[PDB]
């Protein structure tokens with residue numbers, strides 16, 4: 001994972017991308033298609049683009065560059081926001097509290113039990129299945145940070 | 154990964170948790186400590202609590218259950234937000250576009266080159282290292298989704 005420092009360097013340069021997303025997107029795609037021509041073969045809608053000049057002239061290649069970098073920016077920002085809340089919790093539970101993954105499993109089971117007990121009408125089999133998967137994914141995310149910190153959970 | 158409806162079910166039940174977070178946090182910790190007394194030994198503040206009654210009267214245990222469910226709710230909400238953008242991208246690139254992970258590495262290389270070319274002042278060696286790490290983690294998150302779909306990227 002990225003530290004707060006590394007995410008800050010990523011988000012700082014992404015601010016420059018957002019000042020001209022279409023220009024950056026066009027340049028990225030032309031760099032990709034000129035360096036690795038097999039990648040252009042994946043775009044049926046760009047079959048008419050046969051030279052770097054034709055690529056530069058394409059309205060729809062520039063529009064697609066905007067689609068790509070807009071989607072990537074969103075995913076980078078949402079990943080950083082998740083990391084900013086997960087990392088401090090994994091740090092303390094690895095290093096200070098020393099909480100095994102087995103104990104995170106026990107509290108996950110307790111949350112499911114209390115939700116079923118307090119919300120039987122609402123928290124039905126499908127919703128309980130959804131929460132079981134969400135808490136498993138949470139434990140796996142902590143376990144990956146544990147392995148990085150050298151803490152055997 | 155949760156389906157779109159599955160994340161909405163998790164967010165919906167967390168709204169109910171937040172309507173009585175103190176009560177939910179008490180009942181979760183009481184269920185953990187009564188079901189798995191070995192977990193109570195990690196809490197130097199609570200380890201003297203013997204019965205559900207004593208645990209229920211502890212202001213310190215109630216305070217802590219609220220801190221736990223507040224932290225977990227924030228991580229679930231940030232995970233849901235990241236998944237909502239990552240999942241559809243992985244789905245289309247596996248099932249419709251059939252994009253190998255190597256081609257995502259080629260476009261990552263192009264992004265790093267264009268940012269270095271355009272913004273050298275905000276994209277020195279340390280910032281480039283950070284972006285390399287962020288795009289490798291993005292590719293690994295896509296690869297994880299490919300594996301779930303049985304697409305060999």
Ligand code: HEM
Pocket residue numbers: 039040042043044045067068069071072241242245246250252256257260
């Ligand atoms: C940073 C990496 C990438 C991002 C963020 C990205 C994002 C997107 C988005 C948002 C779409 C439109 C919605 C969708 O179908 O999912 C799309 C479409 C597509 N992408 Fe990607 N993409 C990436 C990399 C690639 C690469 C490397 C290739 C091929 C070498 C590729 C091939 C395609 C194709 C063929 C389409 C459909 C184009 C069309 O006909 O409309 N993608 N991509």
Ligand code: HEM
Pocket residue numbers: 088089092093097099103104107192193195196198220221222224225
């Ligand atoms: C969903 C799971 C969990 C969440 C969200 C969570 C969250 C938190 C938070 C926010 C804190 C305070 C800030 C910090 O030190 O990081 C904390 C402290 C702590 N947690 Fe956890 N925790 C979880 C599971 C567990 C489990 C299973 C145990 C033990 C079996 C545990 C033991 C502790 C201890 C000992 C502290 C320090 C308490 C104190 O000295 O006041 N945690 N936890």
